[PDB]
Amino acid sequence: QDRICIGYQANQNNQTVNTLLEQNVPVTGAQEILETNHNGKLCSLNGVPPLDLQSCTLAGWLLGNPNCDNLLEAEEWSYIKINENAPDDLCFPGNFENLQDLLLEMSGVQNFTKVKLFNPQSMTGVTTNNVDQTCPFEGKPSFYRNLNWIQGNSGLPFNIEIKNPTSNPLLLLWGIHNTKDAAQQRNLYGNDYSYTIFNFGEKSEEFRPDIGQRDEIKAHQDRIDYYWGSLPAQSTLRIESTGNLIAPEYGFYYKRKEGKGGLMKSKLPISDCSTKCQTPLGALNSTLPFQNVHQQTIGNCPKYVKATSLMLATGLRNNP
Amino acid sequence: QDRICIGYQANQNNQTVNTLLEQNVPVTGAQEILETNHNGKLCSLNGVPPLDLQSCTLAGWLLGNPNCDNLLEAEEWSYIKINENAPDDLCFPGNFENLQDLLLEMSGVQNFTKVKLFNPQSMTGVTTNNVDQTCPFEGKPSFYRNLNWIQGNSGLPFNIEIKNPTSNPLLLLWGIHNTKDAAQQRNLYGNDYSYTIFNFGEKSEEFRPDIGQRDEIKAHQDRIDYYWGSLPAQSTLRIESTGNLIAPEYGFYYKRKEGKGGLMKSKLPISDCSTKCQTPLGALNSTLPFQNVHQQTIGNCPKYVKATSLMLATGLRNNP
Amino acid sequence: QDRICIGYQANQNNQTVNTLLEQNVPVTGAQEILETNHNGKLCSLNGVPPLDLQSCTLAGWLLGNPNCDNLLEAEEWSYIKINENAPDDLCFPGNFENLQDLLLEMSGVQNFTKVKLFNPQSMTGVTTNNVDQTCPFEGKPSFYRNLNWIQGNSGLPFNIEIKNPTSNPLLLLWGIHNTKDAAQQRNLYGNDYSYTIFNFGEKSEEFRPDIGQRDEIKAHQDRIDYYWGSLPAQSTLRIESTGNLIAPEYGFYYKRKEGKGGLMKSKLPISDCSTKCQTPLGALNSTLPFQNVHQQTIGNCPKYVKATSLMLATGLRNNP
Amino acid sequence: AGFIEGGWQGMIDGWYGYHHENQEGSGYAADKEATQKAVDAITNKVNSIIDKMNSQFESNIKEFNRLELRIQHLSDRVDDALLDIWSYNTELLVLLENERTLDFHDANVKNLFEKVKAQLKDNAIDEGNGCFLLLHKCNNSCMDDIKNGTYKYMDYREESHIEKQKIDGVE
Amino acid sequence: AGFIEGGWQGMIDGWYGYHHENQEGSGYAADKEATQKAVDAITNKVNSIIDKMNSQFESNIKEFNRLELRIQHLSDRVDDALLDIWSYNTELLVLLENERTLDFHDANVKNLFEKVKAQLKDNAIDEGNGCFLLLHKCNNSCMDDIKNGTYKYMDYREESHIEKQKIDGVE
Amino acid sequence: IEGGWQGMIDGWYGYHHENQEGSGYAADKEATQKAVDAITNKVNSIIDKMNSQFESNIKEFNRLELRIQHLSDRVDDALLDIWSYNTELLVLLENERTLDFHDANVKNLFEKVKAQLKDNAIDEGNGCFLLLHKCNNSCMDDIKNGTYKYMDYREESHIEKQKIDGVE
């Protein structure tokens, strides 16, 4: 007998998919919409390399720890790779104030350029560029490159005027010298107590030393409290101090990439590659909507889901 | 021959919808479920108008700047329109402490009424109602309406008790006078160093003047730190001071609308209209579930999506 | 004649469901996927009981308020029940610094064990274990169990070394005595002004008394500022002071359950029950994906939704 | 001149309907109850997608200074994550509901066709284009009985069998 | 008594079934393997909607003071954003799955009907109400052959052809 | 209806005729291409509609920010639960619909042929038509093409079915 039939394809595909009704239904074609592969590298984001601090911390680098003289001169970065146990941090012992906000503020910047803020040689009745064995450079007592330790004022005020004539903010770092006792306070700054006042228009901050013997470290019972600030565009900072001020000599003009920074804690080094999405485990080169590589991500990334696979059926039910 | 057919409607509708399977499918009917329009107004939120601090800042207004005596007497507001470049702020140079939290605290209030906190005339051994050229009222040296500059205590402690008997919190504002040097401190308050202590039960805050020459602004090398606080219902505040206190003379009872305030930065003026959803670009008069006008919204609003249209098919396939 | 029919089941079920197309469609069977029941109890989380600070606050218990000596010795807890106006808090009037973070840090811990930090009898030129009437233990002047009030140093410095040899952090609490006047300062510590310095490596904090008369509470015009800290594993804290130090005598080794604590404000007492999900109204014993009991939840819980029911049709359309 | 598999420009009066051809003339006629049933359902679906959104009172702040950076970073993250959720889901929701709405209309006109089929049976020939060639005479009274589900099979059985035999033979 | 356009109160033993009428009597019988296939599929659907939610350990705090107001604002924003997301998505999910579940049961009784139809062919008359008027004699052994998809067409062809000619007029 | 055909390649759905010439399979390429275009467009939709913000994740911190860290970690899990649950269900639903979509395509391919040979064939009840006449590679073809002429085989089919029963 003559006989015509209607039917559909079946092949040798072992792909199975799950549906709301049945599980592990064999199909002739299935698509994976979950990205599960990365390149195992720390890359540049869209061509912009991250900031590699190497043996230094952000603080050590910005302050200008002599051992950080080799980094160097990075103009822009898409994110920062943090080296946790970086040895080159604060060479002179002390506290860093508000480090976390500085981290956020520096997480992604554009036109980063160092600037000389004032000329110490213009100053009179004072000693400038003071050094210490604790901040050595090649077997000699040095100090932070971007800071200036001022002494010998004999209890008299000295003044520093800082100006930001650009349309970008100006990053400033400085310190307050916490003397160990009155005898050191008098010998260095010629008084028993000092004030240091930062003037941003009508706004002002006053700094006072916290005098007292700290437990000895690096032959120092005294400390330095390190501060940072941001002098806005077209603005002026005026400083007056009767001592204890480690002056800001070098600052940095910078433009921060709005809502486009990043802080990366990773053991991987930095490679010569680029990506639009980065994880601590490596970069994702994906056009897929979902990924299960890592939740902590930077850039334009697929959404992180708690799944091992997302098999989307395309083909037919494969039952011969 | 006799025939009967089954068919469907076709019309002249140019509307097309996208489906999971096909794109730009013509239809006889389609609904837009995405709000794309606003009325271009700053409206009241359910009949409750926003707060317009025109040329004054919130601080300037609440402190009683002599140029902010015209605003005025707004009992309630649903959100605050922020004028970032308001000229009338702090007429006496200094810092305002914790401005952001105050902005939040006052974002939406109901029964906002001013109260006299204490009577300066009842005080002895002291000068009250002290004025200054920097806070002028009609060509003459004045001071903040709601604050009272106390001096001439001759090193002796004075006391102020402030009681909140009502069932609502009470907003207080005050200042601390940062003298320029020991001479001015000795001269106004009869000592080298004062204390000012606020007492809320066993809880206390001690303020000290920060003495030192600030950069000269408005012929002042001294400053005032301005503080705000909130005295809970059925609570008593007791103040003792030996100088440098700019006393809180007028405060404000207020009831805050829980989880229902707002801060708005907009160049639009405040119109005489009402809405349930407010954006910086204008008000959303929408019963639709989604909008694409603005992400920064106040009120009961449609969800912000990144889409130009959401055409929901209702009609049939329009292929004749 | 002879006929056979195809048909479906109908029954006496009064359950209805809603669909995208129709509402209140009668069905032969439906499932609820919205949990709406709770047991009205505060329970243990997976066998781990919450922390019951009965008449005490967390501050009172950790400092060792004599009225908290009965609690006691809880090694672990899954979350904390904050008490409705606990009477036993700060027996000596004052301020507790950074309480909220301490609430967080302690919201869930594992190996909570008390340690003696130093031995007061080993100290010389000083008076230890001082008591006051404001901290009574059964009608007798006493003091905090875990703090040591040191006096009579005659202006001379005294030293305390705290070592944490374990692999878990060590919780420390101490206080700074804010004396009422210079006379009391001299009479207790033999100076006009003291320093207390905490050393953690190069990092240090300096504490100074805030001398001044507070309002008289519990026969005290002086106060105490209470502080807390976490000394990390394998670390050492060194303290030097010339007065005003309420020393840390007993601390707590603890291991925090990462991202797995909780703070519970409820009027319900603690019951002898267990659950995997806890609300202020009661425990949720559910395998269902959603709940409408409470938004504030602790543990592995169904998502909160703003719905009265979620009837999922399983059966057939029930039109007989 | 008859669909489906093609739309009737000038059906009007309804979404789904009939077109007849006999001795008295032609004419379209909408199935009002089947059209009204579908309108109610589609209206219900549209209202469900719209009315089930009852968003809370919320306020957004992006105007802010620097020194709380950490909070503003988190706040911006939440803003952007909320946007990605609502954007993606709503795109798919619309794409899905449009695919299903078109399927819904299809199933409605097919059932309409099936109802007629189950009435006529072998008294008609399935032209396979959505039309039925009647094997007998169907005046306007007969066309109405079909559209109303009251067409009686046996009343036209003999005439249809006889006409089918004409398509063959022979006596 | 003859439905598919209506539900059988007193079907029992299953979701989808048969009702026969012959010389020996009447009775309902559920198609167990088709019922069990739907019971399995529905069970899997309900389980999917329920078991695929695996929520993390999470703790919520709203008890808090003033001075972190900023943080409490964001925390409340997050809570409400999460609430709107889960409320709206779950409502729509339940509405959608109910519509499809109902369509799932319809398709099942419809395929059961089409299976019976493909066996009987012209040996029976579609009454248009989910019933088949058999053009021959069908004892209980015949009924069970149909319910078991074992009914043989040719074994009743002649008797049916005779019975239909009777219907088509013999004079 | 009994299952798919191993060795039916070069098309998703199609025909497998069997006359006196011989046997063999064939693919309905237009019906296949429609389905292939659609399923592709579905997959593209699920992929392309995902537009992602520039996101920056921070979870490295300390102990002096414990309130913000707690909220940040809470937001992370909540985002995790949403995207996990929703995607899982998206896949399950779409896999069910895709399979339903295939069954509908071959079934309409079946009903389009059945509509061409009304009386001229017996429905075997398994997607196969028992033709009541001789059908060579011009007949089986025109059925596939949609041009089969029901009248050009009417009388011969009636004779055959008459030979399937009695007569009076």
Ligand SMILES: *[C@@H]1O[C@H](CO)[C@@H](O)[C@H](O)[C@H]1NC(C)=O
């Ligand atoms: C078949 O499945 C196995 C599972 O072990 C896998 O390794 C292999 O790649 C699959 N091959 C096919 C047919 O895709």
Ligand SMILES: *[C@@H]1O[C@H](CO)[C@@H](O)[C@H](O)[C@H]1NC(C)=O
């Ligand atoms: C430097 O800033 C300018 C501003 O005009 C910008 O155009 C340029 O892209 C920046 N440099 C880099 C490397 O992006």
Ligand SMILES: *[C@@H]1O[C@H](CO)[C@@H](O)[C@H](O)[C@H]1NC(C)=O
């Ligand atoms: C202030 O609040 C009180 C609540 O008791 C209310 O009675 C009163 O109407 C409010 N004032 C105005 C004028 O709205």
Ligand SMILES: *[C@@H]1O[C@H](CO)[C@@H](O)[C@H](O)[C@H]1NC(C)=O
């Ligand atoms: C922590 O607690 C458990 C009891 O729950 C105890 O057995 C274990 O030894 C403790 N861990 C340490 C630090 O020994």
